[PDB]
A and B are shown apart, each in its own frame.
Chain A
Amino acid sequence: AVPFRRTSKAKKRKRRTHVKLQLPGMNECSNCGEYRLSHHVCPECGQYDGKDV
């Protein structure tokens, strides 16, 4: 339950191939014309589907 050999820089870098994080699924609001997440209420112009919640 204890490592036998130390991990090289190659193997320590190969394992982190999948330790990245994805790009957010943003979009563009029609009214305020700035970036926004899909299916979410627009934070600044404070509206959704053009209703001004």
Chain B
Amino acid sequence: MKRTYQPSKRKRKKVHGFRTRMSTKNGRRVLASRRRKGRKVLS
């Protein structure tokens, strides 16, 4: 069986990365709401 999660370093950073969040009006909203909860890790 081939499962759903096939890890990759580059594919993770270029979809859910930080610089991907900061290049969108709605992406910068995700970091804004994760700072409100005071989460330890952003992106």
A and B in direct contact, judged by CB atoms within 8 A = no
